[PDB]
Amino acid sequence: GSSGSSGVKFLTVNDDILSMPQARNFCASAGGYLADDLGDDKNNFYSSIAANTQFWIGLFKNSDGQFYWDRGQGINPDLLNQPITYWANGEPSNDPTRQCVYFDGRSGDKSKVWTTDTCATPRPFICQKHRYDSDHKPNTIGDASGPSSG
């Protein structure tokens, strides 16, 4: 059996408020990464759980000034090159203090939930696991594993 600590739920808003640079690091350590919001079926789903709740997302501005997607710790991020966006009225913003983006649940307009803000403000986030699955079983390639201690 497995009864320890590690066990962060996926696609779920974690009360524990943490800055962008604090959340992205957590999800990774736990075993996941910020849940990206690219696609209606994806947004329409968040808006629900985002019932008047503002949480961070995989959308974050980089040095250059472009918005990328969180793909874990170290992993190469993805550049926002999608035709569909949710940028609020005027967003993204051109403020030097605001670089990160957080889903605005309160925003009645689901199409205007995207909003840029400082990566220091403590806010909730959502961790997600890779979309990897198993299909064929060529070999076990397994090896006795042991417990972990932080």
PDB file of C-alpha atoms in Angstrom, residues 15-91:
ATOM      1  CA  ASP A  15      -6.227  26.301  -2.011  1.00  0.00           C
ATOM      2  CA  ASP A  16      -2.554  26.617  -1.072  1.00  0.00           C
ATOM      3  CA  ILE A  17      -1.816  29.975  -2.698  1.00  0.00           C
ATOM      4  CA  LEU A  18       1.628  30.301  -4.280  1.00  0.00           C
ATOM      5  CA  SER A  19       3.287  32.677  -6.743  1.00  0.00           C
ATOM      6  CA  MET A  20       3.897  31.590 -10.337  1.00  0.00           C
ATOM      7  CA  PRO A  21       7.571  30.833  -9.575  1.00  0.00           C
ATOM      8  CA  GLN A  22       6.355  28.964  -6.493  1.00  0.00           C
ATOM      9  CA  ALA A  23       3.513  26.949  -8.019  1.00  0.00           C
ATOM     10  CA  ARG A  24       5.213  25.737 -11.197  1.00  0.00           C
ATOM     11  CA  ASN A  25       8.040  24.477  -8.983  1.00  0.00           C
ATOM     12  CA  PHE A  26       5.626  22.659  -6.673  1.00  0.00           C
ATOM     13  CA  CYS A  27       3.650  20.760  -9.312  1.00  0.00           C
ATOM     14  CA  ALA A  28       6.971  19.581 -10.743  1.00  0.00           C
ATOM     15  CA  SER A  29       8.330  18.405  -7.390  1.00  0.00           C
ATOM     16  CA  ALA A  30       5.028  16.677  -6.631  1.00  0.00           C
ATOM     17  CA  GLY A  31       4.886  14.977 -10.017  1.00  0.00           C
ATOM     18  CA  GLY A  32       3.194  17.213 -12.559  1.00  0.00           C
ATOM     19  CA  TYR A  33       2.939  20.668 -14.112  1.00  0.00           C
ATOM     20  CA  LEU A  34       0.558  23.615 -14.450  1.00  0.00           C
ATOM     21  CA  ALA A  35      -2.538  22.754 -16.484  1.00  0.00           C
ATOM     22  CA  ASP A  36      -2.431  24.589 -19.813  1.00  0.00           C
ATOM     23  CA  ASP A  37      -5.609  26.247 -21.084  1.00  0.00           C
ATOM     24  CA  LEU A  38      -5.468  25.842 -24.864  1.00  0.00           C
ATOM     25  CA  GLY A  39      -8.800  24.799 -26.342  1.00  0.00           C
ATOM     26  CA  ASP A  40     -12.481  25.368 -25.606  1.00  0.00           C
ATOM     27  CA  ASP A  41     -13.137  21.853 -24.311  1.00  0.00           C
ATOM     28  CA  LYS A  42     -10.210  22.697 -22.030  1.00  0.00           C
ATOM     29  CA  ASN A  43     -11.300  26.195 -21.007  1.00  0.00           C
ATOM     30  CA  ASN A  44     -15.021  25.455 -20.742  1.00  0.00           C
ATOM     31  CA  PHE A  45     -13.934  22.778 -18.268  1.00  0.00           C
ATOM     32  CA  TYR A  46     -11.849  25.094 -16.086  1.00  0.00           C
ATOM     33  CA  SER A  47     -14.401  27.913 -15.996  1.00  0.00           C
ATOM     34  CA  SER A  48     -16.603  25.459 -14.099  1.00  0.00           C
ATOM     35  CA  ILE A  49     -14.197  24.629 -11.276  1.00  0.00           C
ATOM     36  CA  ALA A  50     -13.005  28.231 -11.538  1.00  0.00           C
ATOM     37  CA  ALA A  51     -16.331  29.341 -10.067  1.00  0.00           C
ATOM     38  CA  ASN A  52     -15.250  32.794  -8.892  1.00  0.00           C
ATOM     39  CA  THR A  53     -11.710  31.491  -8.407  1.00  0.00           C
ATOM     40  CA  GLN A  54      -8.498  32.930  -9.849  1.00  0.00           C
ATOM     41  CA  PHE A  55      -5.665  30.446 -10.369  1.00  0.00           C
ATOM     42  CA  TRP A  56      -2.436  30.371 -12.376  1.00  0.00           C
ATOM     43  CA  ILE A  57      -2.027  28.455 -15.635  1.00  0.00           C
ATOM     44  CA  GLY A  58       0.570  27.122 -18.054  1.00  0.00           C
ATOM     45  CA  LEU A  59       0.521  30.490 -19.805  1.00  0.00           C
ATOM     46  CA  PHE A  60       3.500  32.628 -18.794  1.00  0.00           C
ATOM     47  CA  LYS A  61       5.498  35.420 -20.433  1.00  0.00           C
ATOM     48  CA  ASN A  62       9.191  34.827 -21.125  1.00  0.00           C
ATOM     49  CA  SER A  63      12.205  37.145 -21.229  1.00  0.00           C
ATOM     50  CA  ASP A  64      11.777  37.962 -24.919  1.00  0.00           C
ATOM     51  CA  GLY A  65       8.186  38.903 -24.138  1.00  0.00           C
ATOM     52  CA  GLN A  66       6.309  35.994 -25.692  1.00  0.00           C
ATOM     53  CA  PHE A  67       3.806  33.706 -23.967  1.00  0.00           C
ATOM     54  CA  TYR A  68       4.828  30.063 -23.586  1.00  0.00           C
ATOM     55  CA  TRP A  69       3.337  26.916 -22.057  1.00  0.00           C
ATOM     56  CA  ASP A  70       4.490  25.201 -18.863  1.00  0.00           C
ATOM     57  CA  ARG A  71       5.786  21.711 -19.644  1.00  0.00           C
ATOM     58  CA  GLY A  72       7.299  20.884 -16.267  1.00  0.00           C
ATOM     59  CA  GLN A  73      10.690  21.657 -14.746  1.00  0.00           C
ATOM     60  CA  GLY A  74      13.506  22.091 -17.246  1.00  0.00           C
ATOM     61  CA  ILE A  75      11.374  20.686 -20.054  1.00  0.00           C
ATOM     62  CA  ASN A  76      11.323  22.834 -23.192  1.00  0.00           C
ATOM     63  CA  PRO A  77       8.291  25.168 -23.093  1.00  0.00           C
ATOM     64  CA  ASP A  78       5.929  25.717 -26.023  1.00  0.00           C
ATOM     65  CA  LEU A  79       5.363  29.063 -27.742  1.00  0.00           C
ATOM     66  CA  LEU A  80       1.744  30.233 -27.830  1.00  0.00           C
ATOM     67  CA  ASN A  81       1.079  29.966 -31.565  1.00  0.00           C
ATOM     68  CA  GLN A  82      -2.603  29.032 -31.362  1.00  0.00           C
ATOM     69  CA  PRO A  83      -5.207  30.935 -33.422  1.00  0.00           C
ATOM     70  CA  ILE A  84      -7.718  30.807 -30.569  1.00  0.00           C
ATOM     71  CA  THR A  85      -7.093  32.912 -27.465  1.00  0.00           C
ATOM     72  CA  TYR A  86      -8.913  34.103 -24.346  1.00  0.00           C
ATOM     73  CA  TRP A  87      -6.985  37.331 -23.779  1.00  0.00           C
ATOM     74  CA  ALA A  88      -9.236  39.699 -21.835  1.00  0.00           C
ATOM     75  CA  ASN A  89     -10.307  43.097 -23.169  1.00  0.00           C
ATOM     76  CA  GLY A  90      -6.969  44.594 -24.169  1.00  0.00           C
ATOM     77  CA  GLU A  91      -4.869  41.671 -22.963  1.00  0.00           C
TER      78      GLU A  91
END
